[PDB]
Ligand binder design. Structure first.
Ligand code: NA
Ligand code: NA
Lengths: 297, 297
């Protein structure tokens, strides 16, 4: 059986402040801690990526769930998806409002409907009916995000991949969008093959950065194509990310794990917080080269 | 310069009665001739694919625009997408209501927003900002639609790919939902790489079978991976369709036009209505190896 592996990512975007750096650290760490806690106790890849992504959604330092930005009309609007590498089982939700954890709702889409993708109105019904709490859209709206809303008038995709004890792979990704965005814009995060792809015959990818560009070039699926062509995880990351930059002038990041347990985190944005838990050991960083490898207690 | 072509398809579905084949074969001819006419006046591939699909949307018989099948509330939700193969720009709407031409709105997302994808109430609010008329839903519904859902409480996706004389390729798709589909169920159509994909350096594909299977295997972008690798377009379609078959037990079909100008219509479903125009001729079918060929005025 395989040594489990989990990689976790936040925004593939600009420079981070030294203050937010350490706190970005703690949310990635908690995230990756949780996914790996789930796997070392017999949980699946889906199990791992779901708990991993739930962690970052709950945390207000990241732009999915609570800590999600507000669109141009003063409300949070969220996207998320998740996928089983085993049979390509998937679930996706877009422009969902007023719920704590869209990745969970994404999971229900997959496992309890004959469909993969629900949006806005019907999503919330599906939620409502599956028992998911509604909450006043007040409690998903933090202090510092209405500020950047105003600021911009005149914090990118988070995600997770795993390979579990029994060789299954998965991803999950979730976001609150770009700030002051128009009503109902949908990025890459609920679009299979762009925000993520998982396939037990190749590996799992989650993406971050410019949604539109990630969408145009089907970035996750593309990364896996290079891997099928027999390229290493890094080479394939490099080739896909390079193409996105050269073909549509788009920037971002990606985490990937091949079906053999090989993994890489790579980005073309200035920065991408990431962490990987494997072999009871934690890898973490934000800036290229900045990385550390610590002991997992 | 290149000789231009348009290919259209109706839905990759089960057996079709004599009583419809006649209304459908005519419909397919009209769409091809609309898009070919645009190609005849040196129009863009993107103009032509929009036109053909508009025709199919406006034909009450096709599951798109007028004649869209009904959801669980007896209501009309539609998806669409367009992509321009020159710079991969794209436009898409999911779960839109009370508009005549979803595909024309997707083009308005391509050209007139920073984004590639709008959904539901955003998509509604944009359609206004652009003075797209709020049209009654009983105009969209038919006594096929009304009479189908009532007892389903107990056809398919249309598209076109075009190559213009500049060598540019493009795809369009539209679909009006599924009989008794969950409200807010989004399918393959608005998902770039799934329902379709267009790139001048390979070609363009528009797919049509079972939406979830298409999403799960990224069928449109899959087909293009194979052309990238040396397959002919007929080989490409055969393998991508066969992979969706063996792996996800899903049936459907697609149309593809290459950057070289080689074209094909292929399906694992029983039928898939289709039509093509190239070098003064119109090519057509529904069921296998039955290609009717005639001149175009
Ligand atoms: Na958060
Ligand atoms: Na129609």
């Amino acid at each position: 059986h395989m040594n489990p592996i989990v990689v976790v990512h936040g925004g593939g975007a600009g420079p981070i402040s030294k203050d937010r750096k350490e706190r970005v650290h703690q949310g990635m760490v908690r995230a990756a801690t949780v996914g790996y806690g789930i796997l070392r106790e017999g949980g699946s890849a889906v199990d791992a990526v779901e708990g991993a992504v739930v962690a970052l959604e709950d945390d207000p330092e990241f732009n999915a769930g609570c800590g999600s930005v507000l669109n141009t009309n003063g409300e949070v609007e969220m996207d998320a998806s998740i996928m089983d590498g085993k049979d390509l089982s998937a679930g996706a939700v877009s422009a969902v409002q007023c719920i704590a954890n869209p990745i969970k709702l994404a999971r229900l889409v997959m496992e309890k409907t004959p469909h993969c993708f629900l949006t806005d109105q019907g999503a919330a019904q599906f939620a409502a009916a599956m028992g998911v709490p509604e909450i006043p859209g007040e409690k998903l709206v933090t202090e510092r995000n209405k500020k950047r809303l105003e600021k911009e008038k005149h914090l990118g995709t988070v995600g997770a991949v795993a390979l579990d004890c029994k060789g299954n792979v998965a991803y999950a990704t979730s976001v609150g969008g770009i700030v002051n965005k128009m009503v109902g814009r949908v990025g890459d995060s609920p679009c299979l093959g762009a925000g993520g792809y998982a396939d037990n015959d190749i590996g799992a990818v989650s993406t971050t950065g410019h949604g539109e560009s990630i969408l145009k070039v089907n970035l996750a699926r593309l990364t896996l194509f290079h891997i099928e062509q027999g390229k290493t995880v890094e080479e394939a990351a490099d080739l896909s990310l390079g193409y996105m930059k050269s073909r549509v002038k788009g920037l971002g990041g990606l985490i990937v794990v091949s079906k053999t347990g090989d993994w890489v985190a790579k980005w073309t944005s200035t920065s991408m917080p990431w962490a990987a838990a494997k072999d009871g050991k934690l890898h973490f960083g934000i800036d290229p080269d900045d990385t550390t490898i610590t002991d997992l207690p």
